[PDB]
Amino acid sequence: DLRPVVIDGSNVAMSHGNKEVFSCRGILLAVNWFLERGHTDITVFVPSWRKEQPRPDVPITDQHILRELEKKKILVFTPSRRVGGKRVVCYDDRFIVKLAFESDGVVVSNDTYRDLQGERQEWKRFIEERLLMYSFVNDKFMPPDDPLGRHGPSLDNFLRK
Ligand code: NA
């Protein structure tokens, strides 16, 4: 029944808590929301530099959650590294999109990826049809019952095949 679920870990962690803080529980909270409904195939994507320790230079909370979810075969780090002077991160976005697209699943994010809509035509289609936004109120992950709006489908149908 249930469509595969690809979450954008950075979109979510940033949303949750302080907007200027990578809040890892946001990620957990999202994952459980899908775990409670019965979903078993969930990928969260997050860049690999988010493991390093510490980045007292980038604010973050409950970092230990990231490896916990990697262990449960849900979180997957995206590649990154330090080239010459600074840093180089393989867009999280392409992994998130590709995966969902190639698994005919859904993407949990409030990013619409207007660049990736623009690059490939087929992807623009997919995002319009299968992005799933949300709001957080404190620790409460609240996705809409009307994900495409009055005219599209009910949330339960959105998560089915
Ligand atoms: Na945050």
Author numbering: 134 to 294
Reproduce text from the manuscript describing this model:
Regnase-1 (also known as Zc3h12a and MCPIP1) is an RNase whose expression level is stimulated by lipopolysaccharides and prevents autoimmune diseases by directly controlling the stability of mRNAs of inflammatory genes such as interleukin (IL)-6, IL-1β, IL-2, and IL-12p404567. Our findings suggest that Regnase-1 cleaves its target mRNA by an NTD-activated functional PIN dimer, while the ZF increases RNA affinity in the vicinity of the PIN dimer.
X-ray crystallography was attempted for the fragment containing both the PIN and ZF domains, however, electron density was observed only for the PIN domain, consistent with a previous report on Regnase-1 derived from Homo sapiens. The amino acid sequences corresponding to PIN (residues 134–295) are the two non-identical residues are substituted with similar amino acids. In contrast, our gel filtration data, mutational analyses, and NMR spectra all indicate that the PIN domain forms a head-to-tail dimer in solution in a manner similar to the crystal structure. The previously reported crystal structure of the Regnase-1 PIN domain derived from Homo sapiens is nearly identical to the one derived from Mus musculus in this study, with a backbone RMSD of 0.2 Å. In contrast, R214 is important for oligomerization of the PIN domain and the “secondary” chain’s residue R214 is also positioned near the “primary” chain’s active site within the dimer interface.
